[PDB]
Amino acid sequence: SKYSLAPVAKELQSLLGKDVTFLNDCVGPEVEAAVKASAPGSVILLENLRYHIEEEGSRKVDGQKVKASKEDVQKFRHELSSLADVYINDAFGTAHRAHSSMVGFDLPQRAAGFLLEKELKYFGKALENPTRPFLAILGGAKVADKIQLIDNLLDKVDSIIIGGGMAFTFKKVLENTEIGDSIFDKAGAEIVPKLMEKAKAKGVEVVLPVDFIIADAFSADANTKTVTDKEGIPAGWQGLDNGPESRKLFAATVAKAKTIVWNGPPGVFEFEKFAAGTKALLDEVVKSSAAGNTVIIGGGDTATVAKKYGVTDKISHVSTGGGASLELLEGKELPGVAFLSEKKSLSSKLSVQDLDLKDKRVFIRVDFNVPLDGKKITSNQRIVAALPTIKYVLEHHPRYVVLASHLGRPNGERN
């Protein structure tokens, strides 16, 4: 079956050098029986949690949402729960979701794993107590979306680069720039003044692009040409990337920073033609961490850029999250994180390390949502990254270590 975690159990066994019992489900008498029948200290990997509608809580049948009742959901959670004495969450990328594997273990022995810990830590120090200047680079199509993100960041950054399609609303509202058919956010336009007034009151330098690579159609082979903000964008065109001067301007700002949080590329890097400002910005960000500074790449978007050009090892921290990263930056409490244990901060929270794990049935929600394109993993990175926690727990003599995760989108059904 397509979204089966079967290959992962196979890979994890070698990666661990310890036998891994793979189960064909995550809940049910058979899972409960197999687990109880495991040798002491065994490692067990359950089947894709999302084979069940009550993990997420709903699924879509022909574009028709089908939501599970709270009781069936509470049932699933109870079943998940019955497999463990200790619950460790090491799945940062799903922590912003109020899913069963995230918020359904009704037991006090709950803790964060090393990887989730790292995520919270990095984003915690940056937002809370960074080496200054603290620079935040944002990029995206919509500003209406980033309102709470931008607003939370102004309370902490020294400088903020706003690039990408969202820039245009900022540019048309503030400097009445001639944007062509560029993405304009009528809703965000209303709030830009409020946000700018806040930046001034806090001493934040807001850096916008001053020139743009414009296209006659939003496609990989559209006609392009460079224009400055002064020149403006004509009808039939739209900005899809940073211009040559906006890059020197962003590069200068990047150079000034001691802590950087990058969340959104400056242009459409997916398009070979509109990827220059991004490779440029990304080149700047690497030099900065090379010079010893703290560069954290958030999102999944920006993280894709780091991987695309192969410089992940050059960055202080590329977030695994994506929507989880974003929520941290907006300062929202993550469902799965507010679910964790005490002290309330990011840099805080109970950890695997704090709990007694000997003779304990240790359940760990890992991230084995590895990419596939050969009905076999194409990047076991996520699996490799999960090992320290697994290995830490194993080293502590547990009754066993039950592992759960999701993979792909089975859509609340086996597929």
mmCIF file of C-alpha atoms in Angstrom:
data_model
loop_
_atom_site.group_PDB
_atom_site.id
_atom_site.type_symbol
_atom_site.label_atom_id
_atom_site.label_comp_id
_atom_site.label_asym_id
_atom_site.label_seq_id
_atom_site.Cartn_x
_atom_site.Cartn_y
_atom_site.Cartn_z
ATOM 1 C CA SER A 1 0.000 0.000 0.000
ATOM 2 C CA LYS A 2 1.073 3.560 -0.976
ATOM 3 C CA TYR A 3 1.267 5.393 2.345
ATOM 4 C CA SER A 4 2.438 2.480 4.389
ATOM 5 C CA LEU A 5 5.161 3.111 6.973
ATOM 6 C CA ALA A 6 6.510 -0.392 6.180
ATOM 7 C CA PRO A 7 9.721 0.777 4.422
ATOM 8 C CA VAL A 8 10.454 3.128 7.282
ATOM 9 C CA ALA A 9 10.375 0.318 9.828
ATOM 10 C CA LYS A 10 12.864 -1.409 7.486
ATOM 11 C CA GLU A 11 15.191 1.618 7.238
ATOM 12 C CA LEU A 12 14.955 2.521 10.903
ATOM 13 C CA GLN A 13 16.062 -1.015 11.779
ATOM 14 C CA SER A 14 19.389 -0.532 9.977
ATOM 15 C CA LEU A 15 19.671 3.094 11.019
ATOM 16 C CA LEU A 16 19.170 1.880 14.573
ATOM 17 C CA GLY A 17 20.985 -1.435 14.309
ATOM 18 C CA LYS A 18 18.142 -2.757 16.451
ATOM 19 C CA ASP A 19 15.240 -4.943 15.294
ATOM 20 C CA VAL A 20 12.006 -2.977 14.651
ATOM 21 C CA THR A 21 8.621 -4.744 14.930
ATOM 22 C CA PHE A 22 6.287 -3.154 12.352
ATOM 23 C CA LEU A 23 2.571 -3.230 13.059
ATOM 24 C CA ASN A 24 -0.183 -3.018 10.463
ATOM 25 C CA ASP A 25 -2.246 -0.600 12.491
ATOM 26 C CA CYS A 26 -1.865 1.880 15.315
ATOM 27 C CA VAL A 27 -4.961 0.990 17.319
ATOM 28 C CA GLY A 28 -6.899 -2.150 18.093
ATOM 29 C CA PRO A 29 -6.736 -5.487 20.001
ATOM 30 C CA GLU A 30 -4.113 -6.831 17.588
ATOM 31 C CA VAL A 31 -1.866 -3.810 18.114
ATOM 32 C CA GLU A 32 -2.546 -4.092 21.835
ATOM 33 C CA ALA A 33 -1.706 -7.808 21.701
ATOM 34 C CA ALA A 34 1.445 -7.512 19.561
ATOM 35 C CA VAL A 35 2.811 -4.730 21.785
ATOM 36 C CA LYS A 36 2.129 -6.661 24.977
ATOM 37 C CA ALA A 37 3.843 -9.619 23.313
ATOM 38 C CA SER A 38 7.036 -7.679 22.533
ATOM 39 C CA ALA A 39 10.391 -8.665 24.054
ATOM 40 C CA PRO A 40 11.538 -6.272 26.788
ATOM 41 C CA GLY A 41 13.099 -3.128 25.373
ATOM 42 C CA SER A 42 11.741 -3.705 21.883
ATOM 43 C CA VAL A 43 11.348 -0.944 19.286
ATOM 44 C CA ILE A 44 7.888 -1.026 17.601
ATOM 45 C CA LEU A 45 6.654 1.088 14.686
ATOM 46 C CA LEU A 46 2.879 1.413 14.212
ATOM 47 C CA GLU A 47 1.147 1.918 10.879
ATOM 48 C CA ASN A 48 0.401 5.397 9.485
ATOM 49 C CA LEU A 49 -1.751 7.221 12.043
ATOM 50 C CA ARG A 50 -3.589 9.019 9.251
ATOM 51 C CA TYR A 51 -5.036 5.753 7.954
ATOM 52 C CA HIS A 52 -7.609 6.739 10.600
ATOM 53 C CA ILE A 53 -9.966 9.708 10.219
ATOM 54 C CA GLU A 54 -9.853 10.524 13.900
ATOM 55 C CA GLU A 55 -6.136 11.391 13.916
ATOM 56 C CA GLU A 56 -6.801 14.624 12.051
ATOM 57 C CA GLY A 57 -10.461 14.413 13.011
ATOM 58 C CA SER A 58 -11.857 14.560 9.505
ATOM 59 C CA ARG A 59 -11.281 13.641 5.890
ATOM 60 C CA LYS A 60 -12.787 14.680 2.580
ATOM 61 C CA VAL A 61 -14.966 12.357 0.564
ATOM 62 C CA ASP A 62 -15.249 13.822 -2.942
ATOM 63 C CA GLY A 63 -14.607 17.386 -1.816
ATOM 64 C CA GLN A 64 -17.188 16.773 0.871
ATOM 65 C CA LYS A 65 -15.816 17.133 4.370
ATOM 66 C CA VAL A 66 -16.610 14.238 6.676
ATOM 67 C CA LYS A 67 -15.817 15.020 10.307
ATOM 68 C CA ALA A 68 -15.632 12.279 12.941
ATOM 69 C CA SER A 69 -17.640 12.624 16.154
ATOM 70 C CA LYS A 70 -15.784 13.632 19.323
ATOM 71 C CA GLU A 71 -16.611 10.286 20.904
ATOM 72 C CA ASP A 72 -15.160 8.087 18.125
ATOM 73 C CA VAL A 73 -12.126 10.442 18.279
ATOM 74 C CA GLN A 74 -11.898 10.147 22.035
ATOM 75 C CA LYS A 75 -11.988 6.395 21.463
ATOM 76 C CA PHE A 76 -8.987 6.460 19.083
ATOM 77 C CA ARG A 77 -7.121 8.647 21.527
ATOM 78 C CA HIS A 78 -7.926 6.235 24.364
ATOM 79 C CA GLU A 79 -6.609 3.373 22.278
ATOM 80 C CA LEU A 80 -3.456 5.257 21.375
ATOM 81 C CA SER A 81 -3.093 6.100 25.020
ATOM 82 C CA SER A 82 -3.483 2.485 26.180
ATOM 83 C CA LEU A 83 -0.164 1.623 24.524
ATOM 84 C CA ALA A 84 1.896 3.915 26.731
ATOM 85 C CA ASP A 85 3.020 4.804 30.259
ATOM 86 C CA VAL A 86 5.141 7.756 28.947
ATOM 87 C CA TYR A 87 4.347 10.022 25.995
ATOM 88 C CA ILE A 88 7.066 11.851 24.077
ATOM 89 C CA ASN A 89 6.341 14.210 21.251
ATOM 90 C CA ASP A 90 9.157 14.579 18.820
ATOM 91 C CA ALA A 91 7.044 15.759 15.862
ATOM 92 C CA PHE A 92 7.505 19.523 15.572
ATOM 93 C CA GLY A 93 5.961 19.767 12.101
ATOM 94 C CA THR A 94 2.549 18.568 13.471
ATOM 95 C CA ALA A 95 2.632 20.357 16.842
ATOM 96 C CA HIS A 96 0.495 23.212 15.533
ATOM 97 C CA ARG A 97 -2.275 20.705 14.847
ATOM 98 C CA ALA A 98 -4.729 19.589 17.550
ATOM 99 C CA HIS A 99 -4.477 16.022 16.192
ATOM 100 C CA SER A 100 -4.928 12.842 18.286
ATOM 101 C CA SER A 101 -1.249 11.901 18.298
ATOM 102 C CA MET A 102 -0.520 15.455 19.485
ATOM 103 C CA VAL A 103 -3.143 16.224 22.151
ATOM 104 C CA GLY A 104 -4.710 12.855 23.029
ATOM 105 C CA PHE A 105 -2.598 11.192 25.653
ATOM 106 C CA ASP A 106 -4.328 11.719 28.951
ATOM 107 C CA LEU A 107 -1.314 11.065 31.100
ATOM 108 C CA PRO A 108 1.029 13.339 33.100
ATOM 109 C CA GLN A 109 4.241 11.646 31.855
ATOM 110 C CA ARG A 110 4.349 13.866 28.767
ATOM 111 C CA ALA A 111 7.529 15.427 27.455
ATOM 112 C CA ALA A 112 9.210 16.878 24.427
ATOM 113 C CA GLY A 113 11.875 15.025 22.570
ATOM 114 C CA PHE A 114 15.302 16.453 21.667
ATOM 115 C CA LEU A 115 14.294 17.503 18.177
ATOM 116 C CA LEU A 116 11.094 19.292 19.244
ATOM 117 C CA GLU A 117 13.162 20.802 22.018
ATOM 118 C CA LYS A 118 15.683 22.179 19.542
ATOM 119 C CA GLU A 119 13.006 23.809 17.472
ATOM 120 C CA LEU A 120 11.413 25.551 20.428
ATOM 121 C CA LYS A 121 14.840 26.552 21.768
ATOM 122 C CA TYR A 122 16.119 28.150 18.533
ATOM 123 C CA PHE A 123 12.898 30.069 17.888
ATOM 124 C CA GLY A 124 12.674 30.794 21.604
ATOM 125 C CA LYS A 125 16.032 32.531 22.064
ATOM 126 C CA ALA A 126 15.712 34.406 18.744
ATOM 127 C CA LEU A 127 12.321 35.866 19.562
ATOM 128 C CA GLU A 128 13.004 36.185 23.299
ATOM 129 C CA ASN A 129 16.680 37.099 23.805
ATOM 130 C CA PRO A 130 18.722 37.522 20.612
ATOM 131 C CA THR A 131 22.119 38.976 19.811
ATOM 132 C CA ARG A 132 21.345 42.255 18.066
ATOM 133 C CA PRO A 133 20.660 43.440 15.399
ATOM 134 C CA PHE A 134 17.844 40.878 15.139
ATOM 135 C CA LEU A 135 16.692 40.784 11.501
ATOM 136 C CA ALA A 136 13.555 39.053 10.293
ATOM 137 C CA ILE A 137 13.177 38.387 6.573
ATOM 138 C CA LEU A 138 9.564 37.698 5.436
ATOM 139 C CA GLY A 139 8.262 36.951 1.967
ATOM 140 C CA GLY A 140 4.995 35.738 0.522
ATOM 141 C CA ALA A 141 2.040 36.538 -1.717
ATOM 142 C CA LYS A 142 -0.354 37.703 0.930
ATOM 143 C CA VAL A 143 0.083 40.284 3.681
ATOM 144 C CA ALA A 144 -3.466 39.842 5.076
ATOM 145 C CA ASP A 145 -2.133 36.467 6.187
ATOM 146 C CA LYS A 146 1.034 37.682 7.900
ATOM 147 C CA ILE A 147 -0.667 40.391 10.004
ATOM 148 C CA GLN A 148 -0.173 38.594 13.336
ATOM 149 C CA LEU A 149 3.258 37.401 12.243
ATOM 150 C CA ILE A 150 4.501 40.914 11.297
ATOM 151 C CA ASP A 151 2.822 42.458 14.323
ATOM 152 C CA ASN A 152 4.474 39.995 16.731
ATOM 153 C CA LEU A 153 7.835 40.454 15.085
ATOM 154 C CA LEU A 154 7.778 44.281 15.446
ATOM 155 C CA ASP A 155 7.797 43.806 19.244
ATOM 156 C CA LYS A 156 11.180 42.106 18.861
ATOM 157 C CA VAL A 157 13.165 42.675 15.674
ATOM 158 C CA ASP A 158 15.453 45.628 14.885
ATOM 159 C CA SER A 159 15.052 45.342 11.172
ATOM 160 C CA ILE A 160 12.525 43.649 8.956
ATOM 161 C CA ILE A 161 12.797 42.792 5.275
ATOM 162 C CA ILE A 162 9.422 42.415 3.555
ATOM 163 C CA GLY A 163 9.905 40.803 0.146
ATOM 164 C CA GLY A 164 7.931 38.764 -2.328
ATOM 165 C CA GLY A 165 4.411 39.454 -3.556
ATOM 166 C CA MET A 166 3.351 40.879 -0.237
ATOM 167 C CA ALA A 167 5.814 43.768 -0.745
ATOM 168 C CA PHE A 168 3.682 45.309 -3.447
ATOM 169 C CA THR A 169 0.800 46.183 -1.133
ATOM 170 C CA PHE A 170 3.309 47.811 1.214
ATOM 171 C CA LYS A 171 4.812 49.629 -1.754
ATOM 172 C CA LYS A 172 1.527 50.791 -3.298
ATOM 173 C CA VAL A 173 0.045 51.961 -0.010
ATOM 174 C CA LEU A 174 3.179 53.668 1.349
ATOM 175 C CA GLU A 175 5.124 54.951 -1.647
ATOM 176 C CA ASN A 176 2.255 54.792 -4.145
ATOM 177 C CA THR A 177 4.399 52.618 -6.436
ATOM 178 C CA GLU A 178 3.111 51.797 -9.919
ATOM 179 C CA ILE A 179 2.572 48.091 -9.466
ATOM 180 C CA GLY A 180 1.250 46.531 -12.683
ATOM 181 C CA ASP A 181 -0.950 43.468 -12.413
ATOM 182 C CA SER A 182 1.031 42.584 -9.325
ATOM 183 C CA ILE A 183 -0.746 40.906 -6.461
ATOM 184 C CA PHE A 184 -2.483 43.677 -4.521
ATOM 185 C CA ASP A 185 -4.059 42.929 -1.163
ATOM 186 C CA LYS A 186 -7.054 45.237 -0.702
ATOM 187 C CA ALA A 187 -7.583 43.827 2.809
ATOM 188 C CA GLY A 188 -3.952 44.152 3.911
ATOM 189 C CA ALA A 189 -3.692 47.644 2.395
ATOM 190 C CA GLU A 190 -5.979 48.763 5.243
ATOM 191 C CA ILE A 191 -3.604 47.488 7.935
ATOM 192 C CA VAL A 192 -0.216 48.471 6.451
ATOM 193 C CA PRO A 193 -0.399 51.989 8.014
ATOM 194 C CA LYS A 194 -1.150 50.558 11.464
ATOM 195 C CA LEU A 195 1.823 48.235 11.174
ATOM 196 C CA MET A 196 4.180 50.939 9.868
ATOM 197 C CA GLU A 197 3.186 53.257 12.700
ATOM 198 C CA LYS A 198 4.119 50.441 15.087
ATOM 199 C CA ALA A 199 7.520 49.892 13.470
ATOM 200 C CA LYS A 200 8.406 53.578 13.831
ATOM 201 C CA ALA A 201 7.306 53.654 17.450
ATOM 202 C CA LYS A 202 9.692 50.727 18.064
ATOM 203 C CA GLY A 203 12.728 51.752 16.041
ATOM 204 C CA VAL A 204 12.426 49.051 13.421
ATOM 205 C CA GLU A 205 13.863 49.575 9.970
ATOM 206 C CA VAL A 206 11.387 48.235 7.429
ATOM 207 C CA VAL A 207 13.261 47.261 4.224
ATOM 208 C CA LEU A 208 11.234 46.900 0.996
ATOM 209 C CA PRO A 209 12.388 46.091 -2.571
ATOM 210 C CA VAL A 210 13.166 49.047 -4.835
ATOM 211 C CA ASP A 211 13.242 47.296 -8.188
ATOM 212 C CA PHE A 212 11.634 44.160 -9.610
ATOM 213 C CA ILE A 213 12.000 41.416 -12.226
ATOM 214 C CA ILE A 214 8.655 41.692 -13.968
ATOM 215 C CA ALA A 215 6.906 39.081 -16.133
ATOM 216 C CA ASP A 216 4.214 39.391 -18.780
ATOM 217 C CA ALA A 217 2.541 36.167 -17.531
ATOM 218 C CA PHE A 218 2.980 34.224 -14.279
ATOM 219 C CA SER A 219 4.844 31.348 -15.891
ATOM 220 C CA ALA A 220 8.368 29.859 -16.207
ATOM 221 C CA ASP A 221 8.820 31.221 -19.707
ATOM 222 C CA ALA A 222 7.111 34.585 -19.584
ATOM 223 C CA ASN A 223 8.842 37.639 -21.026
ATOM 224 C CA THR A 224 10.788 39.403 -18.358
ATOM 225 C CA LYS A 225 12.386 42.813 -17.909
ATOM 226 C CA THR A 226 13.715 44.766 -14.958
ATOM 227 C CA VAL A 227 12.055 47.935 -13.676
ATOM 228 C CA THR A 228 12.631 50.118 -10.630
ATOM 229 C CA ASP A 229 9.859 51.173 -8.313
ATOM 230 C CA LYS A 230 10.193 54.700 -9.741
ATOM 231 C CA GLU A 231 9.722 53.446 -13.312
ATOM 232 C CA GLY A 232 6.893 51.264 -12.094
ATOM 233 C CA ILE A 233 5.156 48.172 -13.418
ATOM 234 C CA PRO A 234 3.075 48.402 -16.618
ATOM 235 C CA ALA A 235 -0.340 46.822 -17.325
ATOM 236 C CA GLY A 236 0.098 43.182 -18.242
ATOM 237 C CA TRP A 237 3.089 42.648 -16.017
ATOM 238 C CA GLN A 238 3.759 41.791 -12.409
ATOM 239 C CA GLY A 239 6.826 41.554 -10.197
ATOM 240 C CA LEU A 240 7.948 37.972 -9.589
ATOM 241 C CA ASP A 241 11.450 38.567 -8.184
ATOM 242 C CA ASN A 242 13.816 40.988 -6.522
ATOM 243 C CA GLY A 243 15.612 43.437 -8.720
ATOM 244 C CA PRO A 244 19.436 43.899 -8.811
ATOM 245 C CA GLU A 245 19.358 46.872 -6.385
ATOM 246 C CA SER A 246 16.886 45.369 -3.907
ATOM 247 C CA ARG A 247 19.455 42.595 -3.537
ATOM 248 C CA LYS A 248 22.298 44.984 -2.509
ATOM 249 C CA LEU A 249 19.798 46.620 -0.176
ATOM 250 C CA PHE A 250 18.736 43.273 1.434
ATOM 251 C CA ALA A 251 22.381 42.106 1.420
ATOM 252 C CA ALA A 252 23.397 45.278 3.353
ATOM 253 C CA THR A 253 20.650 44.731 5.935
ATOM 254 C CA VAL A 254 21.597 41.037 6.242
ATOM 255 C CA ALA A 255 25.198 42.041 6.743
ATOM 256 C CA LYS A 256 24.155 44.160 9.701
ATOM 257 C CA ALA A 257 22.479 41.362 11.590
ATOM 258 C CA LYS A 258 23.645 39.141 14.402
ATOM 259 C CA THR A 259 20.465 37.007 14.583
ATOM 260 C CA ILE A 260 18.351 36.322 11.447
ATOM 261 C CA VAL A 261 14.981 34.586 11.045
ATOM 262 C CA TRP A 262 14.142 33.954 7.401
ATOM 263 C CA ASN A 263 10.481 33.178 6.624
ATOM 264 C CA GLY A 264 9.602 33.419 2.948
ATOM 265 C CA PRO A 265 11.722 33.819 -0.210
ATOM 266 C CA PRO A 266 11.997 37.275 -1.920
ATOM 267 C CA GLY A 267 10.529 35.975 -5.183
ATOM 268 C CA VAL A 268 9.307 32.932 -7.073
ATOM 269 C CA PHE A 269 12.436 30.764 -6.714
ATOM 270 C CA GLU A 270 10.532 27.744 -8.055
ATOM 271 C CA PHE A 271 10.798 29.467 -11.421
ATOM 272 C CA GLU A 272 14.297 29.370 -12.831
ATOM 273 C CA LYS A 273 13.752 32.976 -14.087
ATOM 274 C CA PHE A 274 12.523 34.357 -10.799
ATOM 275 C CA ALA A 275 14.950 32.592 -8.525
ATOM 276 C CA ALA A 276 17.869 35.169 -8.580
ATOM 277 C CA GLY A 277 16.843 37.330 -5.647
ATOM 278 C CA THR A 278 16.375 34.170 -3.578
ATOM 279 C CA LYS A 279 19.693 32.504 -4.399
ATOM 280 C CA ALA A 280 21.186 35.966 -3.765
ATOM 281 C CA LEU A 281 19.451 36.420 -0.388
ATOM 282 C CA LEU A 282 20.279 32.795 0.529
ATOM 283 C CA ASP A 283 23.957 33.493 -0.376
ATOM 284 C CA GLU A 284 23.873 36.406 2.064
ATOM 285 C CA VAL A 285 22.334 34.409 4.808
ATOM 286 C CA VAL A 286 25.064 31.754 4.524
ATOM 287 C CA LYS A 287 27.930 34.306 4.703
ATOM 288 C CA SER A 288 26.325 35.644 7.886
ATOM 289 C CA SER A 289 26.303 32.274 9.695
ATOM 290 C CA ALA A 290 29.747 31.613 8.183
ATOM 291 C CA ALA A 291 30.868 34.804 9.961
ATOM 292 C CA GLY A 292 29.412 33.166 13.078
ATOM 293 C CA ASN A 293 25.952 34.726 13.281
ATOM 294 C CA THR A 294 22.653 33.080 14.114
ATOM 295 C CA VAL A 295 20.672 32.329 10.995
ATOM 296 C CA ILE A 296 17.415 30.420 11.409
ATOM 297 C CA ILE A 297 15.379 29.501 8.343
ATOM 298 C CA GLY A 298 11.758 28.929 9.149
ATOM 299 C CA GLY A 299 8.850 27.677 7.112
ATOM 300 C CA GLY A 300 8.974 24.829 4.686
ATOM 301 C CA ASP A 301 9.219 27.260 1.767
ATOM 302 C CA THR A 302 12.471 28.832 2.812
ATOM 303 C CA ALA A 303 13.702 25.473 4.063
ATOM 304 C CA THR A 304 13.108 24.098 0.561
ATOM 305 C CA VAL A 305 15.444 26.824 -0.723
ATOM 306 C CA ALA A 306 18.244 25.828 1.657
ATOM 307 C CA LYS A 307 17.916 22.156 0.607
ATOM 308 C CA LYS A 308 17.449 23.031 -3.121
ATOM 309 C CA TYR A 309 20.881 24.662 -3.230
ATOM 310 C CA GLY A 310 22.412 22.320 -0.658
ATOM 311 C CA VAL A 311 23.422 24.617 2.184
ATOM 312 C CA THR A 312 21.367 23.288 5.081
ATOM 313 C CA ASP A 313 24.561 22.434 6.937
ATOM 314 C CA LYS A 314 25.599 26.052 6.509
ATOM 315 C CA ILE A 315 22.580 27.423 8.433
ATOM 316 C CA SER A 316 22.337 27.576 12.262
ATOM 317 C CA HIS A 317 18.887 26.043 12.104
ATOM 318 C CA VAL A 318 16.491 25.174 9.316
ATOM 319 C CA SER A 319 13.112 24.401 10.827
ATOM 320 C CA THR A 320 11.439 21.068 10.155
ATOM 321 C CA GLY A 321 8.067 22.603 10.931
ATOM 322 C CA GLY A 322 6.656 24.927 8.293
ATOM 323 C CA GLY A 323 3.217 25.893 9.640
ATOM 324 C CA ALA A 324 4.574 25.124 13.107
ATOM 325 C CA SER A 325 7.482 27.604 12.588
ATOM 326 C CA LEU A 326 5.059 30.210 11.388
ATOM 327 C CA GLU A 327 2.887 29.860 14.506
ATOM 328 C CA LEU A 328 5.897 30.183 16.751
ATOM 329 C CA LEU A 329 6.900 33.386 14.955
ATOM 330 C CA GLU A 330 3.328 34.785 15.198
ATOM 331 C CA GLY A 331 3.622 33.873 18.840
ATOM 332 C CA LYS A 332 0.627 31.498 18.856
ATOM 333 C CA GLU A 333 0.639 28.625 21.292
ATOM 334 C CA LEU A 334 1.072 25.341 19.463
ATOM 335 C CA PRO A 335 -1.742 22.835 20.234
ATOM 336 C CA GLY A 336 0.743 20.006 20.767
ATOM 337 C CA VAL A 337 3.137 22.281 22.654
ATOM 338 C CA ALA A 338 0.664 23.912 25.029
ATOM 339 C CA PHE A 339 -0.206 20.250 25.602
ATOM 340 C CA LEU A 340 3.279 19.575 26.939
ATOM 341 C CA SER A 341 4.708 20.064 30.364
ATOM 342 C CA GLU A 342 5.136 23.119 32.565
ATOM 343 C CA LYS A 343 7.101 26.381 32.690
ATOM 344 C CA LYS A 344 5.048 27.527 29.608
ATOM 345 C CA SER A 345 7.932 28.879 27.531
ATOM 346 C CA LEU A 346 9.500 27.401 24.413
ATOM 347 C CA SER A 347 12.955 27.114 25.936
ATOM 348 C CA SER A 348 11.164 25.422 28.850
ATOM 349 C CA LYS A 349 8.785 22.403 28.862
ATOM 350 C CA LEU A 350 9.347 18.935 30.306
ATOM 351 C CA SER A 351 11.741 16.854 28.222
ATOM 352 C CA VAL A 352 12.388 13.152 27.573
ATOM 353 C CA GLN A 353 15.463 13.590 29.794
ATOM 354 C CA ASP A 354 13.364 14.657 32.804
ATOM 355 C CA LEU A 355 11.287 11.515 33.027
ATOM 356 C CA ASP A 356 12.061 8.115 34.473
ATOM 357 C CA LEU A 357 11.850 5.657 31.536
ATOM 358 C CA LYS A 358 13.049 2.324 32.920
ATOM 359 C CA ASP A 359 10.422 -0.417 32.582
ATOM 360 C CA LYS A 360 8.201 2.147 30.918
ATOM 361 C CA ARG A 361 6.081 1.604 27.849
ATOM 362 C CA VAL A 362 7.417 4.653 25.941
ATOM 363 C CA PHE A 363 5.267 6.040 23.151
ATOM 364 C CA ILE A 364 6.988 8.478 20.835
ATOM 365 C CA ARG A 365 5.255 10.537 18.174
ATOM 366 C CA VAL A 366 8.049 10.847 15.613
ATOM 367 C CA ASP A 367 8.273 12.421 12.154
ATOM 368 C CA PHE A 368 8.699 9.572 9.643
ATOM 369 C CA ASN A 369 6.802 11.508 7.002
ATOM 370 C CA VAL A 370 9.700 11.016 4.625
ATOM 371 C CA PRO A 371 9.193 11.953 0.980
ATOM 372 C CA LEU A 372 8.492 9.096 -1.386
ATOM 373 C CA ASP A 373 8.866 8.709 -5.127
ATOM 374 C CA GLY A 374 9.593 5.067 -5.495
ATOM 375 C CA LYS A 375 7.180 3.752 -2.855
ATOM 376 C CA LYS A 376 10.381 3.930 -0.836
ATOM 377 C CA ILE A 377 11.946 6.904 0.914
ATOM 378 C CA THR A 378 13.807 9.457 -1.204
ATOM 379 C CA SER A 379 15.197 11.244 1.860
ATOM 380 C CA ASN A 380 15.520 9.401 5.170
ATOM 381 C CA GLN A 381 16.579 12.680 6.786
ATOM 382 C CA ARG A 382 13.487 12.850 8.952
ATOM 383 C CA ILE A 383 14.181 9.256 10.100
ATOM 384 C CA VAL A 384 17.862 9.992 10.849
ATOM 385 C CA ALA A 385 16.897 13.124 12.799
ATOM 386 C CA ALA A 386 14.533 11.079 14.987
ATOM 387 C CA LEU A 387 17.224 8.737 16.339
ATOM 388 C CA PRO A 388 18.679 10.682 19.306
ATOM 389 C CA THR A 389 15.401 10.551 21.223
ATOM 390 C CA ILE A 390 14.723 6.921 20.263
ATOM 391 C CA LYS A 391 18.299 5.985 21.175
ATOM 392 C CA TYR A 392 18.147 8.069 24.419
ATOM 393 C CA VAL A 393 14.971 6.184 25.473
ATOM 394 C CA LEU A 394 16.355 2.799 24.433
ATOM 395 C CA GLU A 395 19.515 3.445 26.448
ATOM 396 C CA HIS A 396 17.262 3.852 29.491
ATOM 397 C CA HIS A 397 15.740 0.362 29.538
ATOM 398 C CA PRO A 398 12.031 0.880 28.605
ATOM 399 C CA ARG A 399 9.424 -1.954 28.566
ATOM 400 C CA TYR A 400 9.504 -1.029 24.891
ATOM 401 C CA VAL A 401 9.404 1.980 22.559
ATOM 402 C CA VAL A 402 6.228 2.295 20.465
ATOM 403 C CA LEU A 403 6.665 4.737 17.576
ATOM 404 C CA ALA A 404 3.837 6.489 15.769
ATOM 405 C CA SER A 405 3.742 8.897 12.811
ATOM 406 C CA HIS A 406 1.885 9.850 9.678
ATOM 407 C CA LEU A 407 3.027 9.676 6.080
ATOM 408 C CA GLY A 408 1.693 11.319 2.960
ATOM 409 C CA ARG A 409 -2.052 11.851 2.837
ATOM 410 C CA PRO A 410 -3.925 8.494 3.109
ATOM 411 C CA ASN A 411 -6.990 10.658 3.820
ATOM 412 C CA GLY A 412 -8.445 8.899 6.885
ATOM 413 C CA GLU A 413 -8.390 5.535 5.184
ATOM 414 C CA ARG A 414 -5.875 2.879 4.191
ATOM 415 C CA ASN A 415 -4.221 3.869 0.924
#
